[PDB]
Structure 1
């Protein structure tokens, strides 16, 4: 019982983009092309860019979902650790257990799948204005990679799916995530092994 991670550009040429932020000590969020991996800080904005060759129909929705990267952990549902789950950091919209939030969107919607028990967060797709090339969604990870009782140092992927108003699949892309203190340092260090 594991959700697909196969890349699928679909009819609209769906692709993911990121800020080219570098690895200076102070950066809150930074992406590695070589690793296909996002490094970001706990509860900080992590911008993900949606790129399309053609504008998807109105009613299109954008869902984000987390799964564990290692195959022997994939069936386990990724959720916040007991401490954070119990934390007073609610924004009034996100369920307390949910790892991934979206900020600054009053039309945000959260799901507990009645059959898989997996969490996900979905927002209406917005087209870029004619002077921009992509759409930006501001994600937040609400639990650390090192949190004991949660992910517990196990690496995760985020799966972004493009779907119509009826929930049918239009596109899919994914990237690995590490939530940590000092993404800049951890990115340079992990990239050094190459």
Structure 2
């Protein structure tokens, strides 16, 4: 099977937000609204905002999962390549096989679905703090899109779901991701090719 990727704001008006980082050759993470695509460097911080019209119940959680964008690859579990899964770079919480990690959150949980075998990382949803209108989760992608034996140049989508305490769906959003050496240049290139 394959996880749904249908955008769903739900009862709480859930949707994602991205910073405006620009396309300088030195940028480490940049988002393209026109392509609904995040371009980022390997293992660098990717700030992702969570926006809601009303605060969901305590116990609400936020899960991140990657799936291949191409239908012919959709059933394949997105995982780190044979090289990176063995480079001993775990932060002591993320299993070395997981592509997506959450930075600086000791309550982050990493799941290996006993049924689908898919990987995901989930954290408790925290309402915005004083002075803020949104909540930010810092994600890391641990393989390049080009890693052989892994993503292998195949594009992926990250699906973010707002879930209740039982894991039931409250909201969903998604975006394409390309992990590369020069996000600024690749974003500029792809947006141009779009024109």
TM-score by length of 1: 0.99
TM-score by length of 2: 0.98
Distance 1:151 1:129 in 2: 36
Aligned to 2:137: 137
Superposed displacement of residue 131, structure 1? 2.2
Superposed displacement of residue 168, structure 1? 1.0
Superposed displacement of residue 56, structure 1? 0.6
Gap runs ≥5 in structure 2: none
Distance 1:150 1:161 in 2: 24
Distance 1:129 1:104 in 2: 16
CA RMSD, 1 decimal: 0.6
Q: Deviations over 1:114-170 (max 9, x none)?
A: 000000000000000242111000000000101011000000000000001111110
Distance 1:86 1:141 in 2: 15
SS in 2 for 1:159: strand
Distance 2:167 2:15 in 1: 19
Distance 1:156 1:24 in 2: 23
Aligned to 1:106: 106
Aligned to 1:147: 147
Q: Deviations over 1:99-122 (max 9, x none)?
A: 000010011100000000000000
Distance 1:129 1:19 in 2: 18
Count of matched residue positions in the alignment of Structure 1 and Structure 2: 194
Superposed displacement of residue 88, structure 1? 1.7
